[PDB]
Design a protein around this nucleic acid. Structure first.
Ligand SMILES: Nc1ncnc2c1ncn2[C@@H]1O[C@H](COP(=O)(O)OP(=O)(O)OP(O)(O)=S)[C@@H](O)[C@H]1O
Ligand SMILES: Nc1ncnc2c1ncn2[C@@H]1O[C@H](COP(=O)(O)OP(=O)(O)OP(O)(O)=S)[C@@H](O)[C@H]1O
Ligand SMILES: Nc1ncnc2c1ncn2[C@@H]1O[C@H](COP(=O)(O)OP(=O)(O)OP(O)(O)=S)[C@@H](O)[C@H]1O
Ligand SMILES: Nc1ncnc2c1ncn2[C@@H]1O[C@H](COP(=O)(O)OP(=O)(O)O)[C@@H](O)[C@H]1O
Ligand SMILES: [Mg+2]
Ligand SMILES: [Mg+2]
Ligand SMILES: [Mg+2]
Lengths: 348, 325, 319, 329, 261, 261
DNA sequence: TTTTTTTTATGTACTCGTAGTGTCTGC
DNA sequence: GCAGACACTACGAGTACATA
């Protein structure tokens, strides 16, 4: 077991950061009439930890005994699609985005069977069940429009805890039905305290400067920070102040792709950059993270009266990417527009 | 006897004389019926103009009640109208005779725009081959969804929008038979908000009679929720006369007090822009901007930001109009 | 007995009564006189007389052997993969005695609705039994008929009818029907027809039945002016960045009751064949498609069409 | 004796409990008296009361014993294709009205078809509904519920009497929230309820959810303004002043820094767009600057409505207002 | 209150298996005289009249007249699970919509209550002319069903001609002509097999084959079917049930055009 | 090492098309007393027990207790090429991972062997409690095939009750309910039609329609069908396959939905 | 002088394989 | 009288495409 899973807190009182929010969530779910929840924030903030702490507070300690459940759903086109599901003796977790555009079928058939069934044991298990819809920001609009009446009819029997990164992708019919719970990212000091507590629980010594550099390099992601802390323990046991932190391959590949964009502005360089973007897309990297990393690196080499136009260009082509279906067209259009703007800026 | 029906179905023109607007088309159709030479009809136009009621009056005039089931095969979009139906029941109805009394049959195809291209292509020789025994009437709203062969086979009558001059006496008859108190401005508001559609005029009249009991301009514009012409003129005056914060405060106060929606405001402002003698570039910019705002309101957007953009589209061109001189 | 409409009562029964495409109709008349006609595909606009020419040629070639040596199939029939294998093929092998120069005629009207596999199965029965049988196909869009079928025939193509060609048959129908008329009303009938003889006969019968006299305002009371002739002038007004006249024509077409889908479709058809620059036409077509996306998703008002007109005027002033 | 959350516990059971939708409530009340109920179309912002009004109405007209035999409710949560409209809706509309109420209350001679969330219905499936309402209106009625009337086709719009559900006013929402707080043995200050009706923006479901969640968070004590501010996700004013200071600085590095601060603190971009627009329409900027900043705010809010990325839209809007603030410098 | 009772259930089975692929919905017209059913098919070409006498029922009571629209696709799945030597009960209240179809199993122990839901399709009453027919022919139903099946092999529409000598069946099909002429075959031991001619005027009409074979599914109902024909009024295939009533059929002729030549 | 010989080839042509659509694997457990098959679905709703004793085989040689798993997709295509009244022999070695299946004629020079890959599946025995139920009744097999097909035209979930009068089969839907109560048919010539009730506590439960209809194509395997069920114990359907063994079925109750406004 | 593959979400149409099933033949 | 063989229609399944 890695450090991200071995030292996860179990109850709401064990969380080191956002303790006031932990007390508020403790007071929220005590009576049992709490509404649907929309736990949202940046990735790696601790949203799933707080959701499982809420599930630990509501039911017994039986919410940690999980199992893999498989269900085959019939599409309107009569093509069978298998979907995986984490389930417990008290709650169930669904990721409908694994079905692709058939998530509406998952909402219409899989969720109604859970919501329309009252719980078998009423004394050990409570008066309601909890369904965890994870990554509802990747849900299509048809699935979100199929979701809303299930959250209104069987609410007093089937409760929902929706988890997402951005609430802009959630339709306001869903956003009106659920209480939004904001989980911000922990700051540098909270990540340093968590890393120091993890290293002290393992019998190690962690300097403050190395923990600070691990916190800044993770970009306020506690999962990523604990992973590079474990990797830095693995590669070199003496924790020096200037110890090299390992990096993921797709981020440095994106950095080299943007360096190749800056280095030459020609159609065959555009073809090579398109090949690099095909390599990035085939490794299941999402295209909006490709656009974000591209804007993160290409703005370092831009001059001060060019960064706003590049930012507006990136946002415009990202919106056209989310409107369309093929990522390579909008990605290569953004790259070609940046090369045209860079050539016009440098030649004048 | 009294019946529980909506007023758009309780008051239906069962005869051709009860329809109001298309007098020349209905005179030609009555001369087709009286001379026993009714051809294949293609009744097209905007909704609510009386295309279904015209062919229902024609079928009621042509055939009696004791033989209506043997002569009219009425199929609409609620029934399945595939190529199996065209090669099956429709072809067998067209190619056979009548059980009770000798005469020509009628196949009414309501919502013929919703039919597939395969069924429309299979319908051509059924129309052409058996034109002596039966006649086909196609009723559609979009003529582009009907193949040009079917448009060639059937003579077309454009049932255009109902002008408010001839639309008044039918509403007066409905008012007199429904015992409704109505003023002149109430009838003007009905024939203005209906916009060539007698169905929503009767719906507005029934909803205003249920909501208030009286039909006045205030009651109609309150039940419908439409803004009045004076308030649209005031909104245009605020957007063209004052600065951003004062015009924003005035329009937001009016929208909060009246409970207005931005779609009707955009529609009436778009109507008032073409009347106002704008320059060509200013009119082009304004039309593009209001098209962008009205497109933007079709999704889960905030209406306050779109109202600020609607003010912004005129605050941009105020300086251009003034410096044009 | 019930009197037929003038479209089907005044169908030509001989090949000399068919007007328009004089060389093709004359060659069909020569074939009908002599015999040994080849396989024939007639393509053209609706109402030109392809079915009339095929049926007149078959009636003149066969004559009294019509009921046993002619197989007529339409889109109202099946014409699947089984009908070609068991019905066209069995009739092709079927022995019918005939005079010299005369063959069995298999008439396949509206061959666009024929599937690709059925037309593939139609090839070898067409080539093998050509000593005994012949084929006569009629179609509107010739691209739906596959290339091996078109190689097996003399693909005749019909053009849209000239106004004088419609006018001669209008004289014919008027003098057998005793219709009072004026010249301007008949020009209005021709203008409403637009190369369609079915529409000419339908509008003439409607004007004669409704009013009894053919002047211009009697025609235009029940018929309508054609829609893309105004759309051409409004697109021309959009070319010179004149938004006022373009909106005047757009509002006139809006108050006539035309749906936004029909208006934008005729806008696209006019802009397809309009005479301007190629790049300007391409960005016009892109703008038309971008507006048609908004029409298709649900928002369709006069404001969207005016915004499309303003964007088309913006495309000229933005080099 | 299980607990029930307040949005369903205070769901209107009758027509008189619906708030501020005066015209349509009067229409259904005259239909309760026995008048000719037409085909209804309900559209408006979320949380305004479109579903609850027709459900309380159908409970009033039919009672408990006739709800299953006279009301067919279809939403987007079940399948509504062309075949469901052609078979299930048409067979229900062709049924007979039989069975009267046993409590002596009058029974209407029609059925009610509730097509909730009719935006998700296809244009082909909506076209099959037209002559179903035109032919079978003697024995059944149709009520389409939607949020955007542009997604409803013009024949179905023309067939149904349209009632627009307005956003709730501040006064009526204030009295309704005060009555709910009085019925639940809880207390809230004047500033707290004023901030609640300011945050909710005419959404009564959101207001009831926030009031219930503040009651559960505080435990039963005074519901002040600060628990409302930290329960609504409202961005503090210091972050907005820092954003405008970074915009007036004219450098993109501090702009990225404050945009990354706002993204990393979990603040939604819709709330930032709302608060940013509230600041821009109430300061001493020029009319042209306010105009194109508000146009950029509208296009950024639209781009967030199709689910684009938060960070890129925020950096584009902040770059545009940075350029506008540094143009006059 | 309406409580009819079929003495054997095989009579109802053979009726509704003949209208299973033919008629759209069962519109039962109920009176004190008996149960009536006058509904056209889906294509508005054929017409079915069914009259069952009250004297053939076990017990029959009808306080007030009802119009009883019942969907038949859902109805025909209940006579599959019905015995032939068994008891069929039909119930309908005054102002309800349930239709109790109570019977027993082939195992012959249990009551089996099945419910229908009534429909509200208003239908204008189609006036049967009741005019004299210029060709009345008595003929067995088994022989009428056999030569309708043989004629479906050859053609699509059959030319049916009647005269003084007898009926004549002609099918101008794809493979050629199939002509069957039958007459005066009453010189047999059985009384059901008989061809008799009653009227004089000779007619000729063409009918669709897909409805003539549909009408001959009532072969177990009657041993002998009466064929009524004339020039204007349509063809009648008349089944007379022995102790229940009669089943009346109509089929419009097809449109034919002579060659101009 | 496992080698067995069957008396008839129609036993596997009647037992193995029944589980064509229930279970995704065929796990045969070898013991000295006989073979055992205990498998579940992917939905964990139906359990099937198949136990064939060793005394009825033509030959039976067993040395060790193993566990082999056979797939369904290749198996179902094989049995259509097999005969009906022939003998079916099987072969499986100790170290080989390929089960041999032979469906040769009873008098033939050569054999036909269509072997398949043994699937290495890791499953456990849940363990039936074999407790005392609330009602145990005997029913005909062919009649149970008709009444499971009977309710398939009404709804998607059926209700089976079993009181002292008889076993009540109900199917409530949008069309109409249907009630069937088998009782007291001991006065018949055959011993197959004797419907008896043995116990007494009445239990009402709801079971899914599809899994009972997936069972009733194996009805000519046995003569009678024994039905056992309790309040919380799953419904047990018992088959007795001639003299070679017995078959047991298990259905958990179908989950009943809520009632609203 | 250069050729692989399943995604888009319904609605409809075409084509083909398969399975109960009514009916006929024979000892 | 009951087992085997024949063609019959209903139903399940795979595939293509939808514009001028
Ligand atoms: N010309 C008219 N004269 C009088 N009443 C009319 C007229 N047109 C419409 N109405 C009224 O509006 C109702 C609906 O008219 P319809 O004939 O159904 O409209 P429509 O032409 O069928 O439009 P669509 O395309 O089918 S929605 C009628 O029952 C009348 O009450
Ligand atoms: N060239 C023509 N000369 C005289 N009458 C014509 C001519 N073309 C058409 N007509 C008339 O129009 C009627 C229909 O003509 P058709 O031959 O059916 O048109 P078409 O060429 O077949 O077009 P489509 O593809 O079938 S819609 C005929 O019956 C004539 O009355
Ligand atoms: N006008 C109102 N009067 C009283 N309570 C209301 C009102 N509107 C909303 N509510 C409350 O808010 C809850 C939700 O109301 P709904 O009727 O479901 O909103 P809605 O109109 O359906 O919004 P959408 O479009 O479905 S997201 C109800 O159960 C009530 O508790
Ligand atoms: N309060 C906490 N104390 C210690 N570790 C935490 C805490 N919150 C989160 N973590 C760790 O940080 C990671 C965050 O991941 P997760 O909890 O799934 O949130 P998210 O869903 O936002 O990634 C987890 O692996 C968890 O082990
Ligand atoms: Mg209509
Ligand atoms: Mg033609
Ligand atoms: Mg709702």
């Amino acid at each position: 077991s890695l450090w991200v899973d071995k030292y996860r807190p179990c109850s709401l009182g064990r969380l080191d950061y956002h303790k006031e929010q932990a007390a508020q969530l403790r007071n929220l779910v005590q009576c049992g009439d709490f509404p649907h929840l929309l736990v949202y924030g940046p990735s790696g903030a601790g949203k799933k930890t707080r959701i499982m702490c809420i599930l630990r507070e509501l039911y017994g300690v039986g919410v940690e005994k999980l199992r893999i459940e498989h269900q085959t759903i019939t599409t309107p086109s009569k093509k069978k699609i298998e979907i995986s599901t984490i389930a417990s003796n008290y709650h169930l977790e669904v990721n409908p985005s694994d079905a692709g555009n058939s998530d509406r079928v998952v909402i219409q058939e899989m969720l109604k069977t859970v919501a329309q069934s009252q719980q078998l044991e009423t004394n050990s298990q409570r008066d309601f069940k909890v369904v965890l819809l994870t990554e509802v920001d990747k849900l299509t609009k048809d699935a979100q429009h199929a979701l809303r009446r299930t959250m209104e009819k069987y609410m007093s029997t089937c409760r929902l805890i929706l988890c997402c990164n951005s609430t802009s992708k959630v339709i306001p019919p869903i956003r009106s039905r659920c209480l939004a719970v904001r989980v911000p990212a922990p700051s540098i000091e909270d990540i340093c305290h968590v890393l120091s507590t993890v290293c002290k629980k393992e019998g190690l010594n962690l300097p403050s400067q190395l923990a600070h550099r691990l916190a800044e390099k993770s970009c306020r992601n506690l999962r990523k920070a604990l992973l590079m802390c474990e990797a830095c323990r693995v590669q070199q046991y003496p924790f020096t102040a200037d110890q090299e932190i390992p990096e993921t391959d797709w981020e440095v590949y994106l950095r080299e792709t943007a360096n190749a964009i800056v280095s030459q502005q020609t159609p065959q360089r555009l073809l090579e950059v398109r090949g690099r973007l095909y390599e990035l897309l085939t490794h299941c990297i999402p295209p909006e993270i490709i656009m974000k990393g591209l804007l993160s690196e290409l703005l370092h080499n831009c001059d001060g009266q060019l960064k706003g136009e590049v930012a507006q260009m990136a946002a415009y082509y990202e919106h056209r990417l989310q409107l369309g279906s093929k990522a390579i067209y909008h990605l290569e259009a953004f790259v070609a527009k940046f090369m045209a703007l860079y050539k016009k800026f440098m030649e004048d | 006897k009294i019946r529980n029906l909506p007023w758009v179905e309780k008051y239906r023109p069962q005869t051709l004389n009860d329809l109001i607007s298309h007098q020349d088309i209905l005179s030609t159709i009555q001369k087709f019926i009286n001379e026993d030479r009714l051809p294949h009809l293609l009744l097209y136009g905007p909704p609510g103009t009386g295309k279904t009621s015209t062919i229902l009056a024609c079928a009621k005039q042509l055939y009696k009640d004791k033989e209506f089931g043997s002569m009219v095969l009425e199929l609409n979009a609620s029934d399945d109208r595939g190529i199996d139906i065209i090669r099956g029941p429709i072809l067998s109805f067209a190619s056979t005779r009548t059980i009770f009394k000798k005469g020509f049959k009628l196949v009414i195809l309501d919502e013929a725009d919703a039919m597939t291209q395969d069924a429309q292509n299979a319908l051509r020789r059924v129309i052409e081959k058996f034109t002596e025994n039966t006649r086909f009437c196609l009723i559609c709203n979009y003529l582009s969804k009907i193949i040009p062969a079917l448009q060639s086979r059937c003579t077309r009558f454009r049932f255009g929008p109902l002008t408010p001059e001839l639309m008044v006496p039918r509403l007066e008859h409905v008012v007199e038979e429904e015992k409704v108190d109505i003023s002149e401005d109430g009838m003007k508001a009905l024939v203005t908000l209906s916009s060539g559609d007698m169905r929503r005029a009767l719906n507005i009249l029934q909803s205003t009679n249920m909501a208030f009991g009286k039909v006045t301009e205030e009651t109609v514009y309150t039940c419908t929720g439409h803004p009045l012409k004076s308030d649209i003129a005031n909104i245009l005056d605020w957007m063209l006369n004052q600065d951003f914060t004062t015009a924003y405060r005035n329009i937001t106060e009016l929208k909060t007090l009246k409970g207005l929606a931005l779609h009707d405001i955009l529609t009436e402002i778009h109507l008032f822009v073409h009347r106002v003698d704008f320059p060509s570039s200013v009119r082009i910019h304004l039309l593009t901007k209001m098209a962008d705002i009205e497109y933007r309101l079709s999704v889960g957007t905030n209406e306050k930001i779109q109202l600020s953009s609607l003010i912004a589209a005129f605050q941009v061109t105020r300086d251009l109009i003034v410096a044009e001189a | 007995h019930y009197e037929l409409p003038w479209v089907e009562k005044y169908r030509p029964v001989k090949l000399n009564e068919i007007v328009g495409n004089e060389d093709t109709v004359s060659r069909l008349e020569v074939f009908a006189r002599e015999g040994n006609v080849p396989n024939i595909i007639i393509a053209g606009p609706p109402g030109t007389g392809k079915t009339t020419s095929i049926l007149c040629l078959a009636r003149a070639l066969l004559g009294p052997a019509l009921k046993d040596a002619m197989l007529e199939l339409n889109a109202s029939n099946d014409r699947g993969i089984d009908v070609v294998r068991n019905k066209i093929k069995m009739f092709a092998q079927q022995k019918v005695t005939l005079p010299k120069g005369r063959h069995k005629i298999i008439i396949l009207d509206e061959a666009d609705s024929m599937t690709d596999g059925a037309q593939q199965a139609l090839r070898r029965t067409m080539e093998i039994y050509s000593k005994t049988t012949r084929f006569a196909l009629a179609c509107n869009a010739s691209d739906k008929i596959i290339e091996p079928i078109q190689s097996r025939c003399a693909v005749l193509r019909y053009t849209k009818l000239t106004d004088a060609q419609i006018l001669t048959r209008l004289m014919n129908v008027i003098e057998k029907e005793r219709v009072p008329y004026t010249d301007d009303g008949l020009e209005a009938i021709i203008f409403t027809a637009q190369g369609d003889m079915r529409q000419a006969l339908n509008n003439l019968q409607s004007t004669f039945s409704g009013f009894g006299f053919i002047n211009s305002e009697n025609v235009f009371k029940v018929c309508d002016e054609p829609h893309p002739l105004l759309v051409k002038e409004m697109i021309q007004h959009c070319v010179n960045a004149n938004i006022d006249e373009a909106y005047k024509i757009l509002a006139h077409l809006w108050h006539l009751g035309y749906s936004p889908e029909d208006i934008i479709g005729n806008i696209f058809r006019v802009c397809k064949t309009f005479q301007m620059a190629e790049y300007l036409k391409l960005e016009f077509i892109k703008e038309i498609g971008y507006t048609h996306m908004k029409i298709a998703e649900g928002v369709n008002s006069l404001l969207q069409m005016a915004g499309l007109l303003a964007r088309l005027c913006q495309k000229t002033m933005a080099p | 004796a299980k607990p029930v959350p307040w949005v369903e516990k205070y769901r209107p059971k009758c027509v008189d409990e619906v708030a501020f939708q005066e015209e349509v409530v009067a229409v259904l009340k005259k239909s309760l008296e026995g008048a000719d109920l037409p085909n209804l179309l309900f559209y408006g912002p979320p949380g305004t009361g479109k579903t609850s009004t027709i459900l309380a109405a159908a409970r009033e007209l039919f009672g408990p014993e006739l709800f299953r035999l006279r009301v067919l409710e279809l939403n987007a949560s079940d399948e509504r294709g062309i075949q469901v409209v052609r078979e299930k809706v048409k067979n229900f509309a062709q049924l007979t009205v039989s069975g009267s109420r046993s409590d002596g209350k009058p029974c209407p001679p029609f059925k009610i078809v509730i097509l909730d969330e009719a935006d998700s219905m296809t244009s082909a499936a909506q076209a099959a509904l037209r002559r179903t309402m035109e032919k079978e209106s003697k024995t059944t009625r149709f009520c389409l519920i939607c949020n955007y009337v542009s997604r409803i086709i013009e024949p179905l719009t023309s067939r149904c009497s349209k009632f627009r559900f307005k956003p709730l006013s501040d006064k009526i929402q204030q009295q309704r929230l005060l009555d709910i707080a009085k019925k639940e043995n809880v207390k809230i200050s004047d500033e707290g309820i004023a901030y609640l009706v300011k945050v909710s923006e005419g959404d009564l479901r959101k207001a009831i959810t926030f009031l219930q969640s503040a009651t559960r968070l505080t435990g039963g004590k005074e519901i002040t303004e600060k628990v409302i501010t930290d329960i609504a996700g409202v961005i503090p004013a210091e972050k907005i002043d820092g954003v405008f200071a970074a915009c007036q600085s004219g450098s993109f590095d501090k702009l990225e820094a404050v945009v990354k601060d706002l993204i990393d603190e979990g603040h939604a971009a819709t709330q930032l767009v709302n608060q940013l627009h509230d600041v821009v329409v109430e300061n001493n900027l020029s009319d042209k600057q306010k105009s194109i900043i508000t146009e950029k705010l509208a296009e950024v809010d639209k781009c967030l409505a199709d689910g684009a990325d938060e960070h890129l839209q925020l950096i584009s809007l902040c770059a545009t207002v940075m350029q506008q603030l540094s143009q006059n410098c | 209150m309406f409580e009819a009772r079929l003495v054997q259930g095989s009579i109802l089975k053979k009726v509704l298996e003949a209208l299973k692929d033919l008629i759209n919905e069962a519109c039962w017209d109920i009176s004190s005289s008996g149960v009536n059913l006058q509904s056209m098919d889906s294509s508005h070409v054929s017409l079915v009249q069914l009259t069952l006498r009250s004297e053939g029922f076990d017990t029959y009571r009808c306080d007030r007249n009802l119009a009883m629209g019942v969907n038949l696709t859902s109805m025909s799945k209940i006579l599959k699970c019905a015995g032939n030597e068994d008891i069929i009960t039909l119930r309908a209240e005054d102002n309800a919509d349930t239709l109790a179809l109570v019977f027993e199993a082939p195992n012959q122990e249990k009551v089996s209550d099945y419910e229908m839901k009534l429909m509200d399709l208003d239908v204008e009453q189609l006036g049967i002319p009741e005019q004299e027919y210029s060709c009345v022919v008595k003929m067995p139903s088994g022989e009428f069903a056999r030569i309708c099946r043989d004629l479906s092999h050859i053609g699509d529409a059959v030319v049916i001609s009647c005269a003084k000598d007898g009926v004549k069946f002609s099918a101008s099909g794809e493979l050629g002509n199939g002509n069957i002429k039958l007459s005066q075959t009453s010189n047999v031991d059985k009384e059901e097999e008989a061809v008799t001619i009653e009227m004089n005027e000779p007619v000729q009409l063409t009918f669709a084959l897909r409805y003539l074979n549909f009408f001959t599914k009532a072969t177990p109902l009657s041993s002998t079917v009466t064929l009524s024909m004339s020039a204007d009024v349509p063809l009648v295939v008349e089944y007379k049930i022995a102790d229940m009533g009669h089943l009346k059929y109509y089929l419009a002729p097809k449109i034919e055009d002579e060659e101009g030549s």
